């Protein structure tokens, strides 16, 4: 585990932990998922936490979060996640689309932060992220 990987997990955690209290609640999870166009029920949110809630305190701490993400790591689930970003449906995630998703998530990005994110997944160097690229990234 590298230093940059930890900083990414730390930011991924911060995106959920809206009030920055060090834990992720079912409420925070729902807010994020709705902001990405999903609509989990209360039961589903509780189930998500329960699966990784080692200490049974009802909320997710940093390690439990890491476990959640490691368990997350078919075609349909990936396609769906692609469509969260590919808003116009043209088959390419642009920088403007990525920035739009991050902004709905309450995260403001500099053009450089966004470009850097595209750069990470863009394999062919067209400056966009196609489905295959998005699959190589997620897989």
């Amino acid at each position: 585990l590298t230093e940059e990987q930890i900083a990414e997990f730390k930011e991924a955690f911060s995106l959920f932990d809206k009030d920055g209290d060090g834990t992720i609640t079912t409420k925070e999870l729902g807010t994020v998922m709705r902001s990405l166009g999903q609509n989990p029920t209360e039961a589903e949110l509780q189930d998500m936490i329960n699966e990784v809630d080692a200490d049974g305190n009802g909320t997710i701490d940093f390690p439990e979060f890491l476990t959640m993400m490691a368990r997350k790591m078919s075609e349909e689930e990936i396609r769906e996640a692609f469509r969260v970003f590919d808003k116009d449906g043209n088959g390419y995630i642009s920088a403007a689309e990525l920035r739009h998703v991050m902004t709905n998530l309450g995260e403001k990005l500099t053009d450089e932060e966004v470009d850097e994110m595209i750069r990470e997944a863009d394999i062919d160097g067209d400056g966009q992220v196609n489905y295959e690229e998005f699959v190589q990234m997620m897989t």
Partner: peptide
């Protein structure tokens, strides 16, 4: 906005999303 010790990853953001 750049935050020291923090880094925005597309990958982890993907998994974070469905």
């Amino acid at each position: 906005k750049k935050r020291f010790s923090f880094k925005k990853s597309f990958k982890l953001s993907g998994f974070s999303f469905k």
